[PDB]
Amino acid sequence: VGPRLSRRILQQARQQQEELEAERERTTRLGP
Amino acid sequence: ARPGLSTLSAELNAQIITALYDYVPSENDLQPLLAWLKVMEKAHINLVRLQWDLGLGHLPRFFGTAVTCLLSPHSQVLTAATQSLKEILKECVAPHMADIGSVTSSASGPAQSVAKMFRAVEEGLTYKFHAAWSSVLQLLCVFFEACGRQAHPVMRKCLQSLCDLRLSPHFPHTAALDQAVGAAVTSMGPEVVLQAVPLEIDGSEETLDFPRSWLLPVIRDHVQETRLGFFTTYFLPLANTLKSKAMDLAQAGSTVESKIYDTLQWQMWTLLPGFCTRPTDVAISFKGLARTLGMAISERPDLRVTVCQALRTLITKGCQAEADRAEVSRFAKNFLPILFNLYGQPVAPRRAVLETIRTYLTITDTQLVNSLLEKASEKVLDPASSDFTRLSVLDLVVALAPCADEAAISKLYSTIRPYLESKAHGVQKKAYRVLEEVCASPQGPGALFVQSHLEDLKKTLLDSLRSTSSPAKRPRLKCLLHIVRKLSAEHKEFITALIPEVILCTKEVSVGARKNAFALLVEMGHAFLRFGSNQEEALQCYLVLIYPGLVGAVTMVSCSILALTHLLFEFKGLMGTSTVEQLLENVCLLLASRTRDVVKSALGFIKVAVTVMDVAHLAKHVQLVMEAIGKLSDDMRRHFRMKLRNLFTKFIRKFGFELVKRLLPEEYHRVLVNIRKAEARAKGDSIEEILADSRQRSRAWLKEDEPLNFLDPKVAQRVLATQPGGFKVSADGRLIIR
Amino acid sequence: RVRTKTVKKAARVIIEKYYTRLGNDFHTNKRVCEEIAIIPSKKLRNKIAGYVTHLMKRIQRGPVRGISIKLQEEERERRDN
Amino acid sequence: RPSELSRMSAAQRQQLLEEERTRFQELLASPAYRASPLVAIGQTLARQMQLE
RNA sequence: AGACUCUGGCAUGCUAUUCUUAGAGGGACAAGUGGCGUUCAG
């Protein structure tokens, strides 16, 4: 295919994989 | 700072780590990410130091985040993650595998944590990286080295995935994957590795492109802790089948396939030096290879040296135990007639066989060494032996000489003593090698023979000095070394009789004899340093022995200048600066000679004297030596230009340039200004890889056949990290090379 | 001593075209250099033979598949000619 | 008798060795060569190659 | 601190030839072994 096209393809595939794997407040307290 | 329990506890560190997991700035900010996983690495190190199982339990989430940041395009994050995970593996994982032990598929404690983090690195071996694969391979390699013996039942799938990765048409990480599989073979052991990925070269194959043919070089280069019993039970009948098929296709007319199988069989006994490195069952599995090694060393020359090398490998590191050494000795009583017939046969790789014979005779019993010495002595004394056979048996005598007791050494010396006056150079050379070998041992029967027969040896060496051939000078001086390092004080006459031989050997034909003569000059100096209370007066008494050699013959003059050069290079500060100055005046007088060898050795002595003594003492004699340099000659200046150039460079560097300019004429003025300008100017195993005519890393290449599935576990074979893709002939067809 | 670049090129082309006929030690490699090249220079012949011996010693420790496909291609070229 | 030892013969080397051994024997026992050795060596070389 | 050119040590081999000769041909190519090594150059 080519370097740039395959890079865009893998980036979009990783984005879609993260989006489909997806479907608060930072814990500032060390001890409860 | 690694705080103690009073400053930071294990539960507090775990709470800090779990609270610090929740930031992960964006993915690739690259300013706080490196220090971020650095501080979790340090906190995990401190947690393991405080409570190791808690740190191992907290490890897999940090390893998952390490994989996630290893997916980042920035290579600095890749390097930081690789260094952090390697440090965690080396310091927090490797020493704790002995306590945890083996891991199964149903582990519960920290073994389950090891399994989870190995699942994390297996997920890190997937296709989604395509630029960190060298880093993941290095992490896999250090994990294999750390936990091959303790993570054995689980990493077969990773080995299959690695074989699939190396089965790619264009793999730039071939060397890294080879190193990783080599570490896996080293620590795992190639037996269960071959159980996981089988070799497809078992007997008859319909094809010739073996997809796992690199396993044999991997096992050859990376086996150190594997039992020999697996080698005997697996590689013995497969060798016979492959060799039999090799001759069967050899006489069938198909030479290409026969040569391929010949390459296979010749490579698969190269695993034997690896398997003989540290075998865990060599006390019991070496019985089944004795007759195999005998038949492979008797009628199979093409393996012999390698087999000998394999034997040598064992003698390097397989004789640690006493039962192993006893078995090796008993099979030495089995093998020695075969090895002696192999070395003594007419023609042959005699050098490696002789080295193996010496190294193998140093670790056997004394009594059959004595018996073989009797046999070799009656073979030498037999007049019906040829000259080559006599030389071979004399080499066997040389090998058997230091391994015998005092009586056998004494009778061998009594037999060798009339042979020192023989007109044959080879016989006298072997006799002097025998005399060097029997005196080489500083302890044992050889030393007892040395002190028992010191006067007889001295008288024999003084008598045989007149009739010594030129090659025989090379070992004999070493023998003199072997009789000086334990010499008594009342032996000055013998030493000063030996001095002219050493000086004449400082310019001997062989450079090994010259090095031996220089070492012998050092040994005479050290021996005279022990024979007197005053070291400077003893050095002067050593020096008055060799100074009259500056008077007589021209080659003796050159030999004496070279001897004084080596002495000044070895006795710099202990002999006296004024003696160096007066010798410098003398050697400049010798610089004013006509013979090129004398003036060349004089230039060498002048350079060494410039190097040795201080510039304050040099400045008193710069004018004299440099005047002697200046009015030398026209042709002599032209011939050895570089020695005078280096001398002028040293004089410029160690002094002022103005006086150096003033003390030379116009041609040397041009030489000096050119030298000043020059000073101012100063201020992997594949066939095609060897035969080579000798941002950017983020590029990817897809290949489009079967449709591509990203979730297919074998899609990583279809992605490539790199770009895919003079003489004349005569009438007979022969090339012309010029 | 170092190896001259033309020695490297000659060793490369010899081990590339005639890998099958070369043998293990120095003597038979020198013989193959004798009746494969006229080679008027003796020192060049000796250096070429020694470097070809070292090259095949390095090659024979590698994987077998490259040697096998090289022999297959050499046999195909010999049969075609 | 060449100046380089790599061209001369071994019997000549042994004869030269005997000559140098003997010469060391008389010149090591000479009484003038006991008090100022390097002075004697320097004077001997000075006369020998002012002769040259 | 010459990775220039040429050449020598041993020839009981050839020629008018083991001792003196003078032309040619062998023999050395780091060849092998163990370590230090980016595991390849050194």
Side-chain angles (χ1 to χ4, degrees), chain B residues 190-332:
Chain B
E191 173 164 10
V192 179
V193 167
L194 285 181
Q195 289 179 238
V197 294
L199 270 190
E200 279 150 347
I201 319 168
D202 309 339
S204 83
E205 306 93 39
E206 64 96 28
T207 187
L208 287 178
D209 43 355
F210 315 102
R212 279 159 177 164
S213 54
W214 47 268
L215 273 178
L216 294 175
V218 160
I219 288 167
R220 161 187 62 83
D221 292 323
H222 287 98
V223 160
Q224 79 186 13
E225 274 157 341
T226 318
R227 48 183 289 269
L228 200 63
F230 164 64
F231 181 78
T232 60
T233 52
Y234 186 73
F235 292 104
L236 281 184
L238 194 139
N240 288 342
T241 57
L242 282 193
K243 193 64 179 193
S244 160
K245 193 192 185 71
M247 290 67 78
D248 282 0
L249 276 72
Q251 284 101 28
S254 62
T255 56
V256 161
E257 290 87 6
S258 179
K259 190 72 74 67
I260 291 160
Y261 277 109
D262 186 79
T263 311
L264 286 156
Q265 58 85 28
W266 191 38
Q267 291 191 4
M268 62 80 70
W269 286 276
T270 60
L271 312 177
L272 181 60
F275 269 93
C276 278
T277 296
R278 285 168 212 96
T280 72
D281 56 346
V282 76
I284 62 170
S285 297
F286 189 74
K287 264 77 72 174
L289 269 180
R291 296 294 96 194
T292 309
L293 281 198
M295 71 66 68
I297 211 167
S298 279
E299 67 262 12
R300 291 287 302 270
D302 201 19
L303 321 169
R304 269 185 198 142
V305 186
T306 311
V307 169
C308 290
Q309 190 185 350
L311 284 181
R312 288 198 301 272
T313 300
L314 186 80
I315 306 167
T316 302
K317 54 185 74 67
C319 284
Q320 299 109 344
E322 205 66 36
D324 291 331
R325 193 174 181 270
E327 288 288 324
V328 161
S329 306
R330 195 251 297 173
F331 281 124

Side-chain angles (χ1 to χ4, degrees), chain B residues 91-111:
Chain B
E91 307 301 313
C92 300
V93 179
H96 296 261
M97 294 298 102
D99 298 332
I100 289 159
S102 179
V103 61
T104 187
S105 60
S106 70
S108 70

Side-chain angles (χ1 to χ4, degrees), chain B residues 166-167 201 208-214 216-217 220-221 255-257 259-260 262-264 266-267 302 309 684-694 726-727 730 732-738, chain C residues 5-6 8-22 24 33-41 44 48 55-56 58-72 75:
Chain B
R166 216 197 165 281
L167 274 188
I201 319 168
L208 287 178
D209 43 355
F210 315 102
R212 279 159 177 164
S213 54
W214 47 268
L216 294 175
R220 161 187 62 83
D221 292 323
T255 56
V256 161
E257 290 87 6
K259 190 72 74 67
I260 291 160
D262 186 79
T263 311
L264 286 156
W266 191 38
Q267 291 191 4
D302 201 19
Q309 190 185 350
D685 290 331
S686 56
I687 290 177
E688 63 266 14
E689 192 140 357
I690 303 166
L691 316 172
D693 302 333
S694 53
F727 299 105
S730 76
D732 200 272
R734 299 162 66 197
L735 291 179
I736 300 170
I737 321 291
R738 202 177 312 276
Chain C
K5 273 310 170 194
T6 182
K8 184 77 172 70
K9 167 149 60 51
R12 280 198 217 107
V13 65
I14 280 173
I15 205 63
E16 269 171 351
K17 70 182 184 294
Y18 282 150
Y19 172 73
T20 65
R21 293 179 58 179
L22 283 148
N24 198 13
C33 287
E34 278 283 339
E35 65 267 12
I36 289 300
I38 64 150
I39 188 65
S41 167
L44 184 62
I48 278 171
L55 273 187
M56 61 79 70
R58 194 180 164 187
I59 278 169
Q60 279 293 106
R61 302 186 104 215
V64 191
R65 55 156 81 85
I67 294 155
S68 167
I69 64 183
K70 180 172 183 57
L71 259 67
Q72 274 190 161
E75 193 263 330

